[PDB]
Amino acid sequence: NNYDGDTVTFSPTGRLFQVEYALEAIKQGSVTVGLRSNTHAVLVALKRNADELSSYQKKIIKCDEHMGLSLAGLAPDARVLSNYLRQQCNYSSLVFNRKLAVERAGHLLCDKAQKNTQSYGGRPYGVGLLIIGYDKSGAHLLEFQPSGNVTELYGTAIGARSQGAKTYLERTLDTFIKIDGNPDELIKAGVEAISQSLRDESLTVDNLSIAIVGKDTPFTIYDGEAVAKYI
Template identity: 25%
Template sequence: MIFLTHHIPWNSPSGKLVQIEHALTAVGSGQTSLGIKAANGVIIATEKKLPSILVDESSEPIPVTQLVRETAAVMQEFTQSGGVRPFGVSLLVAGFDDKGPQLYQVDPSGSYFSWKASAMGKNVSNAKTFLEKRYTDDMELDDAVHTAILTLKEGVLTPSEIADYLEEVE
């Protein structure tokens, strides 16, 4: 999460929400992340991070749409409330519930959209263009993982990082 440490007016003379633009800029400079919804699941890929021992892996099941809607509502509230600033993050939310695999992207403004495949971060244009060429509705998880690695390879990961991913997948 990025916290803005200086005061930025909410609105510019043109009527734009300046803090939302700054939050979107912060998201755009972050690590490239992408999500792909396959026929039998959803994957999210990004730079490898070590898991924290503080993560509680047991949680109450919740429909994916409800989770996204509630998270987006909190983010949207922070764009309009006095004394708080918008979240400087976008989220890729993947889940599997009674409606099957789902992938959503939530922006700092609180807007959210359902996606078949999406990307965000530094190389978003290249990644989305690559995903548009490679994605198919009948894609299975193995194909989605392969497509994610190829997408990240297009300018995000080094050859040794790709080798690490391939070892973990196999």
């Protein structure tokens, strides 16, 4: 109200409204799902078009051979944060000959977002990210909020109508965690999860975007006729 003019101002109840408004941009974004087993980790994303002449906005970005994310909210902010992750993954490989741990990648994203919430002149990031990866401790899934809060999960969803997919994953928890050594079935579970968030529209060949990373599987993105198999 009187306390939402900038990020440097607490409200009388201890809230940061500019950060909360940045969180609101994620809720307007298109739905994206993340889930994992013990061998693989999967991202599923519903892409959004402007109209029938337009392309469908890409949602998934590769960060390294073993790591990548999906976005929901301001796309240019995801480009800035994914570029930072690419650099950090790269610094780890060049200096230490070491693949960057997914947990450490989450810590770095948290700290970068935090600086934009405590200083004058700047603004919070307006995007939410789901980071998947396979490192020395197996498969991982992370959820990033521009408040700075990063959380490690078995599965989750962000964007508009993400609550339906999140409840489905909460039911299916015991089933999909056991899908080891079967990439197709894990993606099926992710496609079935994101379907619980659809209304009026359904999953078409240029609508659906899928990404997977695992034990002997580099981070790869599937679009176009490559996802017709799962429709």
